[PDB]
Amino acid sequence: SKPNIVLIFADDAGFGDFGFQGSTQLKTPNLDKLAQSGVRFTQGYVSDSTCGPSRAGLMTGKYQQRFGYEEINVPGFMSGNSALKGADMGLPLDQKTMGDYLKEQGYKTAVFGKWHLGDADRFHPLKRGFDTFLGFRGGDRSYFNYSEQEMKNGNKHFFDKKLERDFGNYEEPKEYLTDVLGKEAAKYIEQNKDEPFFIYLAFNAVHTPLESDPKDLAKFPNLTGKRKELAAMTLGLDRASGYVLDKLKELGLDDNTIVVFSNDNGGPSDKNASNNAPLAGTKSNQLEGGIRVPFLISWPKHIKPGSTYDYPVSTLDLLPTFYSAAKGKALGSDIDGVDLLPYIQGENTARPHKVMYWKKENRAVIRDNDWKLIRYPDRPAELYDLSSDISEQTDLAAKNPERVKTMFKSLFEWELTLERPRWLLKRKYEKYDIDRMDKYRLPATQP
Amino acid sequence: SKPNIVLIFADDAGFGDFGFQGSTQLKTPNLDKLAQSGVRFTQGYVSDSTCGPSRAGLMTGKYQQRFGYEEINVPGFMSGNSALKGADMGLPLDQKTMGDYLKEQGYKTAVFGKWHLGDADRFHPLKRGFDTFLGFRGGDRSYFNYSEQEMKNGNKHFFDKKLERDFGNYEEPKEYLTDVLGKEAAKYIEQNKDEPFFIYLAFNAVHTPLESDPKDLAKFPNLTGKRKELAAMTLGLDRASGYVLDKLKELGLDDNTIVVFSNDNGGPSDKNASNNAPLAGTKSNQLEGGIRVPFLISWPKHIKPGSTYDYPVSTLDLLPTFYSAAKGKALGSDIDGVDLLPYIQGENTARPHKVMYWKKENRAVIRDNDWKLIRYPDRPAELYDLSSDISEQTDLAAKNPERVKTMFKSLFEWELTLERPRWLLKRKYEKYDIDRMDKYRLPATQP
Ligand SMILES: [Ca+2]
Ligand SMILES: [Ca+2]
C-alpha cells in the first residue's frame, strides 16, 4: 500500500510571511498545524528565483538549465532573436515529469492552478503525466472570473490566463480562485480515496494581481495598501490549504499521505509587499531572499512531529523523494535531487547536498557547504559564510581569494554540463532584476 | 576625384608574425613596404577575437552584438537549441554594409576570398552591396582545388567552402588559393582602373588548414612543423598582397588609393603556430593577444610615410573612415566607429576611443583609456594598466576596488544596449576557448 502525495506550491510568497516562519502580522493557522505535524526545513531552496525555471526543476528533479530552461518563459516578453516565443516556450517533451514517474507506479495524478510549463497543446498537463487538470497554462490571472468582454478583447497570449478543466474545457471560477482550487483538490481526494493519488496544488496565490475576498480584508484593518492585500490573499491560501488537510483527516487518509508545502521562488517585495525576513533580496535575484523558500514535509507515523532540519535541501529532491516513497525502482540516472527520507529520519547523517548551483545567464551561484559565491554581470563576485551571516551583508571575497578562485572553477565546471537556453528575455529585464536586488540589499525584518 | 580603397584583411595571423611587427623568423617584404609608406597603428583592435563577429563589426562600423551577432556562425557547431542554424546564420539583412555605403558614392565594389557573413543566397555578397565576388561563403577551405570526389562526398555545409565567382558560378582554383585571390584583385583593379573602386580582399591565409606552395616551404629550412607552414603561407599572403600593391603602382593609381592591411582576430597559436608577441592570449579570448591586430593605413601624398599612431583604434572605424574619404554625406546615426583621418593627420589630438568594449556571453572587456577590465565565467574579474603592462600579468583589481566597480557598471550599462544573440555555439567550446587562454596566459616572445 503506497502513500498519497500532496504538493502544495504557493507563488511569490514571502520567506517571512507565515506563522511557522515567524510572522507577527500575517495569519497561517492551517499551515502552522501542518508545520507542527511534521518537519520544517530552515534551508529549503527552489532551483531558480523565478516561476518557470523553478517549476521546470521541481517537475523533473533535474537542474532545469541542463535542458535549456534557463530564463523565465513569459509570452510577449522574449527577445525578437529568441529561438522559441509564445506557446512554443515550454518544458522540453524529452523530459519525464513528476506526474509521468508516479503514473508508472499506478498513481492517479492531478494539477490544480498555475501550470506555466508551456501554453501550446503539446506542453499541456494531460500530455505530461496528469490524468486531471483545473487551472491555467500561463503565469498569472485574476482571482475572480473574467467577463465575456475581457476574454473577447484580449491579446494573442491571454488564452493562457483562462481557467481550464482537463483538455480545453474553458470555464471561469464561480468564486475566489484560491477557494475554487482548494475545494477542487478536496473533491479530487474524496473521488480518489481508494487508489493512491498525487496532487500538485499550484496556487497562483500570492502572485499579482493583488485581489482578495472582501471577507479576508476586514480581518486586517491595521494593515494598509499592498500589505493589507498580501495578508488577505495569504489567509486565503491558508483556508484553501485547510480544505485539503481537513479532507485527508475527515477520510482517515492523513495516516498514509505525504503533504509538502513550499513556494516556487522568494517574494517580489515591490509588487506584492512580501517580506523575506530575515533574508536580503527578492524574486529574480540569487541572494537567499530569491532562492530560499518556506518548506514543510508532513508524513504522520513516518516523520516526527514538530521537528526542524537545518541542512540545505532543494525542490529538486521532491521527485526522487516522492518516487522512492511510492516504492519506485526505475529512477532515471539524469536526476540531480536525492531521496530526503533517509536524511529526515536520521538513517543518513550526511548533508544531502555538499555543492548546490543557480544560474540565469551571467548571474550564477555556487554553495559549497555554507560558502555562497555569487557572480553578477555588473560587480565583483561576492563570497558569504551562511553559517554566521544568513543575510549576506559581509562580503568575504577579498579575505578569501583562493576559496573564490576554486569555487569559481567548480561553478564553471557545472556550467559546462548545461545546454544553451531554449529562449531569451528582452535585454532590459536584466536591469529591472538588478535594480530590485539593490533596492532590497539589506536584511528584511518582521514588523 | 574620389580615392580607390583596398582593405586587405588576413585570417588568424599572429600579432608578432610580420616584419613591421618585429618578427625574427617570418618574411613580409611587401607588407613591410606598405607599413613604411603610411601609418602603423600600435593599438589596432578588431570588435571580437573570432572570425564571424569580427567581420560583422568591420562590415557595419557597429558593435556587432547590437544586432545579435555575438558568437561565431559555424554551421554544424551550434547548439540544438540555437535560434538559427546552418545557412540561416548570417549578417541580419536590416544592416547596411561597407559595400552598400560605397556603392551609394558610386564605387565599383568587390570582395575576394573569405565572406563568412552567411551561406544562404540572401546573405550573399552581391545582395550586400558588392558588384563582384570571387571567394567562398563559409569560414575555411583548402588552399588548393577540391577533387570531384571530395565535393560529392561532403556534409550538408560543405557547399560554403567551394570557390565561387559572383552568384553561384562554382569553379575551383587552378593554383594556390592565396595567389588566385591576389591575382583576381589585380585583374579587377586593371578592369576598373578609370572609375573609383572598393576591394575587400579577405585572404583565408593564414587560417587552417596548414597548406603552402612547396616553393615557399624551401625558403624556411630552419623552421619545423606548423611554424614552417605558417611562414610559407605568410610569405604567400605577402606575395599575393604584392600583386595588388604593384598593380596600383603599374597603373599610376597608388597616388589616389587608400590601402588598409589588418587581421580579423588574434592568432590561434595552438592550431597554426601563430605568435602574438609581446601579447598574452590568442584567438577566442579577450586578452590583448585575441583582440589586438596588425593595422596599417597607407594613402600616399595624404598620410605622412613611416608614422606610428599609438592611441587605440578599431576595425569599426573603417566604414566611417572609408565613407568620409569617398566624400560621403548621409552616414547612419547607429555607427560606433569614428573617421580616423582627422586623428591620423593631427587635426584632432583627442583619443578617437576613450571607452571600448568586447563581449561573448559571460566573457566581456571594458577599456577606459589604458585601464582594461576583463570579466570571465571561471575566475575573478582582472584589471590591467596597458600603459605599463601590455602583457596583462599584473592584476590590479584588488588594489583598485572602486575603479573595478565603476568600470563593471559602465560595462553593464553598455550590455543593456545590445540585442540577445541570434545564434549560440555548443556549450563545450567555452571550455576549449578558456583552456587555450590559460595555455597562452604568459607573454608570447619572438623566437
Ligand atoms: Ca512565482
Ligand atoms: Ca579569423
Numbering used by the authors:
A (entry chain A), B (entry chain B): 27 to 473
The article reads:
S1_19B (locus tag EU509_08890) is a putative S1 sulfatase falling into subfamily 19 of the sulfatase classification. The potential sulfatase activity of recombinant S1_19B was screened against κ-neocarrabiose (κ-NC2), κ-NC4, ι-neocarrabiose (ι-NC2) and ι-NC4 by thin layer chromatography (TLC), revealing activity on κ-NC2 and κ-NC4; however, S1_19B did not appear to have any activity on ι-NC2 or ι-NC4. The KM and apparent Vmax values for S1_19B against κ-NC2 were 292.2 ± 14.0 μM and 0.7 ± 0.1 nmoles s−1, respectively. Overall, the data support assignment of S1_19B as an exo-G4S κ-carrageenan sulfatase that is specific for the non-reducing end of κ-carrageenan oligosaccharides.
The polysaccharides in red algae (Rhodophyta) are primarily mixed galactan agars such as agarose and carrageenan. Carrageenans are high molecular weight polymers having a linear backbone of repeating D-galactopyranose units (G) linked together by alternating α-1,3 and β-1,4 linkages. Furthermore, transcriptomics revealed upregulation of the CarPUL during growth on ι-carrageenan, while biochemical analysis of eight CarPUL-encoded enzymes revealed carrageenan-specific activity, thus associating the CarPUL with the ability of these pseudoalteromonads to liberate energy from carrageenan. Detailed analysis of the enzyme activities encoded by the CarPUL, combined with interpretation of growth phenotypes, have allowed us to propose a refined and detailed model of κ- and ι-carrageenan processing by some Pseudoalteromonas species.
